[PDB]
């Protein structure tokens, strides 16, 4: 009174709109520019979400920053996978209600490859038939899934918070009709593979960010984050926390 799961549901940000002008044909540069700005704003929401997440603010401030910077992409990508799941059964990418990318719009030269790995995320929800509560739980667990090799400042606080939401995930499964053990295996397996698929998105992203000759614009929020997170990733100094080996 109140249950953790109903706190998750209530703190979940409303879906943001892109304001994309589709009067004239899509240019890949300007689609990516529009996405980045949508992205900035969604990250800003993610930051407010995380602050309201029970346990998060017990962490040292620097650790709050680190976690958000390390996982923003997997959060954004997972939530995208969710909107594409419920909205079009994973057939189209639902970035915003006024920016859906179907098979055609994807054929943009630069787009196709990145788009497939994003599509791979929604198909997983389709295949595993993920519920809302399962998703909400898996989403916080992504926020806590990518850490400095050197560990955090608040390691023991962290370790506990992770435990709590691991158990909250257990509850969302059980809540949803013995073999619940198997579900947990698959869900935690899905969380594991995010590292790989989000890998690629982060690759393109650093690429488009680093190579200013591309004309892909980033908002301040993302730029600050990317330019701080890039050296850390390249130096191979960050670590994924996995459930399986």
């Amino acid at each position: 009174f109140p249950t953790l799961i109903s706190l998750l549901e209530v703190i979940e940000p409303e879906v943001l709109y892109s304001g994309y002008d589709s009067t004239l044909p899509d240019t890949s540069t300007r689609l990516m520019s529009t996405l980045n700005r949508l992205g900035g704003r969604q990250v800003v929401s993610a930051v407010k979400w995380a602050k309201a997440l029970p346990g998060f603010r017990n962490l040292h401030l620097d650790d709050q920053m680190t976690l958000l910077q390390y996982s923003w992409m997997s959060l954004m990508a997972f939530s995208l996978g969710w909107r594409s799941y419920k909205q079009s059964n994973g057939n189209m990418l639902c970035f915003a209600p006024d920016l859906v990318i179907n098979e055609e719009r994807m054929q943009l030269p630069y787009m196709y490859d990145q788009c497939q790995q994003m599509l791979k995320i929604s198909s997983e929800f389709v295949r595993l038939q993920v519920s809302y509560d399962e998703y909400l739980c898996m989403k916080v667990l992504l926020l806590l899934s990518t850490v400095p090799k050197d560990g955090l400042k608040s390691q023991a606080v962290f370790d506990e918070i992770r435990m709590t939401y691991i158990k909250e995930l257990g509850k969302a499964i059980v809540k949803r009709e013995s073999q619940n053990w198997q579900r947990f295996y698959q869900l935690t397996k899905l969380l594991d593979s995010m590292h790989e698929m989000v890998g690629g998105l982060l690759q393109f992203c650093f690429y488009t960010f680093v190579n200013k000759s591309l004309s892909v614009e980033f908002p301040e929020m993302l730029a600050e984050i990317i330019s701080n997170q890039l050296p850390k990733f390249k130096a191979g100094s960050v670590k994924p926390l996995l459930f399986h080996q």
Binding site: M65, E220, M221, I225
Partner: peptide, 11 residues
């Protein structure tokens, strides 16, 4: 230090 991030995290 990402200034906007930090600004958000400290109220």
């Amino acid at each position: 230090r990402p200034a906007i991030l930090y600004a958000l995290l400290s109220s």
